[PDB]
Ligand binder design. Structure first.
Ligand SMILES: *C(=O)CCCCCCCCCCCCC
Ligand SMILES: [Cl-]
Ligand SMILES: [Cl-]
Ligand SMILES: [Cl-]
Ligand code: NA
Ligand code: NA
Lengths: 5, 98, 266
């Protein structure tokens, strides 16, 4: 999961 | 309170001179970094093992530490917990089954 | 009737001396079936549960877990300005109900607080606050996370749950009877009675105190169901009574391994 930026 | 809630218990009902496993389970804490040491008469017990970090459904962390031991009627067994929420180490004495 | 598969993923900027900064623990119902961590870099079954695993399956789990490790690294190195250590957590998995219908779960937490969740039935996200809401809108607009995790939760997880249920069926079905111990300690004028249930499996159990055949819930304390290292569990209940009455109190234990509930005294 790519959550930030 | 995000301090650890700790319980100390043996794997099997305890009886003097019969081999067993001592458990210390800490739960409900954050952050996950924690020190948990099983002790005989104030001296760390040999051969302790630590569970992989997991957590409760409410996100708080928990860890089991255990060590084989043969309980002696003459000794005291305890679990020392150090966590960033505690000013000083907390020592939880094992109430022997006997 | 129903069964559950759950993964518990933790990333840590400060795991402590000798401890891996990223960990995954997988559960089938009440039993750890496998683990991964950033030091070994290998996903590995618990052999006492899954004694005959093929390398192909765990090659795949290892590569998927290493991808999770990198994502947790990426996020933890990119937290908004929103001191101290930080944690990422994720819990995901599926339920298969008795009639075969499926439920999926997928939730994240930052520093131990709810952050973002994904509901596969509605393919919608839920943000726990306005900072998470930035991630939700990006994920929605990008339009790919929802499809990927619909597949992961509703197809892959289900397929793997059924596999572990079959491969692990011997361990999952073997009932282990609790060994019960009751003892008393006389503090001042109070006699505290303890009832400990050791080494039982499956996890669900109840312990109740009774006097003269009537339950006594008001002044009972329960320690909770806690793990042993071998996949069995431990549970306890205590009660305080007058030393003269210590013979009238019974601890009643109910467990799937016990055809009838057991009654125990000091
Ligand atoms: C971004 O949200 C990261 C998602 C990581 C998903 C896969 C995790 C690993 C699955 C296999 C675990 C094997 C060991 C129990
Ligand atoms: Cl590491
Ligand atoms: Cl019995
Ligand atoms: Cl009895
Ligand atoms: Na920050
Ligand atoms: Na019984």
């Amino acid at each position: 999961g790519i959550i930030f930026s | 309170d995000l301090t650890p809630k700790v319980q100390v218990y043996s794997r099997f009902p305890a009886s003097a001179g019969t081999k067993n496993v001592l458990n210390c389970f800490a739960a409900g804490f954050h952050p996950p970094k924690i020190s948990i040491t099983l002790m005989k008469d104030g001296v760390p017990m040999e051969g302790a093992q630590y569970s992989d970090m997991s957590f409760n459904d409410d996100w708080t962390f928990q860890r089991l530490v255990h060590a084989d031991f043969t309980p002696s009627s003459g000794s005291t067994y305890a679990c020392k917990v150090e966590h960033e929420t505690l000013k000083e180490p907390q020592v939880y004495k094992w109430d022997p089954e006997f | 009737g129903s069964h559950s598969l759950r993964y518990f993923l933790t990333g840590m900027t400060d795991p402590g001396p000798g401890m891996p900064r990223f960990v995954i623990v997988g559960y089938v119902d009440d039993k750890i079936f496998g683990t991964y961590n950033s030091k070994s870099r290998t996903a590995q079954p618990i052999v006492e549960m899954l004694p005959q695993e093929d390398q192909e399956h765990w090659d795949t789990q290892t590569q998927k877990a290493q991808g999770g490790e990198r994502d947790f690294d990426w996020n933890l190195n990119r937290l908004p300005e929103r001191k101290g250590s930080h944690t990422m957590q994720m819990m995901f998995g599926c339920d298969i109900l008795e009639d075969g219908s499926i439920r999926g779960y997928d939730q994240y937490a930052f520093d131990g607080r709810d952050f973002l969740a994904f509901d596969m039935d509605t393919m919608t996200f839920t943000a726990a606050d306005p900072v998470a809401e930035i991630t939700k809108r990006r994920w929605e607009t990008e339009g790919t996370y929802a499809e990927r995790w619909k597949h992961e939760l509703g197809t892959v997880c289900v397929q793997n749950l059924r596999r572990y249920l079959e491969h692990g069926k011997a361990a999952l079905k073997r009932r282990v009877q609790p060994e019960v111990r009751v003892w008393g300690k006389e503090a001042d004028g109070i006699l505290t009675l303890s009832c400990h249930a050791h080494g039982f499996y499956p996890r669900p159990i109840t312990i109740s105190w009774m006097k003269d055949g009537m339950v006594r819930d008001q002044e009972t304390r329960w320690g909770g169901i806690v793990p042993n290292s071998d996949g069995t569990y431990h549970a306890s209940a205590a009660i305080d009574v007058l030393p003269e009455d210590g013979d009238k109190y019974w601890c009643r234990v109910e467990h799937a391994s016990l055809p009838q509930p057991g009654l125990f005294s000091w």
